[PDB]
């Protein structure tokens, strides 16, 4: 079999084992809806709380994004400046994408702290404008109806992306992004899924929503800061303190 068809393989893999939920269990989890007391108790809570929880489920997703990454084939073979790079531009990214696996565009609710609930849940933070350009994003790639392979290999291509601003091995990130943007066209004409192409969002989207996101993390971050043990400690100093 051919180094491309390893790839599929090996980057399906690296998904499947970091994956952090099971589709099977969001699917089948999806009846099971936060009720309208359940709803008004987190939008009381202070957003001083409701900033601890998502802090610490957005750190624990990017750190999932982050082993994903180190088990792609030649991610680790790049020089640490380039990982950096890569991960500081691209994790936040792929957490935004992997979403659309927990949201419900039914009844446009997300899976959050073991029930589906929608944006207003999140009341609190004083984000509203921001949280609602994620569920819409999350709502439109939910319509794709992404498979778990089609996800891995996209999110793959979301982190290794040769026009990142800082690369210092420009060529041997393109190298890798040639190799996993063959396996991904492979795979959707092996799978007759070429379909999905068209459908994608515009690079600039994700990138420019990713930069909201962060920055409204930074400023919370600023205010009132979580630690954690970091997976990737010169990548968390990039963005932490
Ligand atoms: O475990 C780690 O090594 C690690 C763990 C997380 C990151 C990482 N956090 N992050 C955030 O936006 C973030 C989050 Cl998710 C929660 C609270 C505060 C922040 C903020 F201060 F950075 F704004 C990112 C964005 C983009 C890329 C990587 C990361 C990086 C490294
Ligand atoms: C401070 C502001 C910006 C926080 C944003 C609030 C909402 C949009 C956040 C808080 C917790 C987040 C979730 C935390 C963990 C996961 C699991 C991951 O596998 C897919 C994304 C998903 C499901 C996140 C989606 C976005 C989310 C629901």
């Known amino acids: 079999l051919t180094e491309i068809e390893h790839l599929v393989q090996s980057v399906c893999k690296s998904y499947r084992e970091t994956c952090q939920l099971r589709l099977e269990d969001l699917l089948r989890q999806r009846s099971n809806i936060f009720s309208r007391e359940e709803v008004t108790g987190y939008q009381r809570k202070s957003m001083w709380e409701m900033w601890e929880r998502c802090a610490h489920h957005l750190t624990e997703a990017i750190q999932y994004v982050v082993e994903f990454a180190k088990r792609l084939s030649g991610f680790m073979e790049l020089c640490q400046n380039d ?3 890569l991960l500081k ?6 957490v935004l994408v ?5 949201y419900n565009a039914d009844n446009r609710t997300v899976f959050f702290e073991g029930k589906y609930g929608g944006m207003e849940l999140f009341r609190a933070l004083g984000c509203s404008e921001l949280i609602s350009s994620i569920f819409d994003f999350s709502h439109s790639l939910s319509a794709l109806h992404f498979s778990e392979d089609e996800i891995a290999l996209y999110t793959a291509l979301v982190l290794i992306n040769a026009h990142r601003p800082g690369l210092q091995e420009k060529r041997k990130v393109e190298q890798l992004q040639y190799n996993l943007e063959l396996a991904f066209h492979h795979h959707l004409h092996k799978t007759h899924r070429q379909s999905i192409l068209a459908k994608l969002p515009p690079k600039g989207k994700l ?6 996101h962060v920055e409204r993390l930074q400023i919370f971050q600023h205010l009132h800061p979580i630690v954690v043990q970091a997976a990737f400690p010169p990548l968390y100093k990039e963005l932490f303190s």
């Open 89 to 94: 531009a691209g994790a936040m990214e792929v």
């Open 207 to 212: 990138r420019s929503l990713c930069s909201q």
């Open 98 to 102: 992997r979403m659309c696996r927990a």
């Open 83 to 85: 990982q950096i790079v």
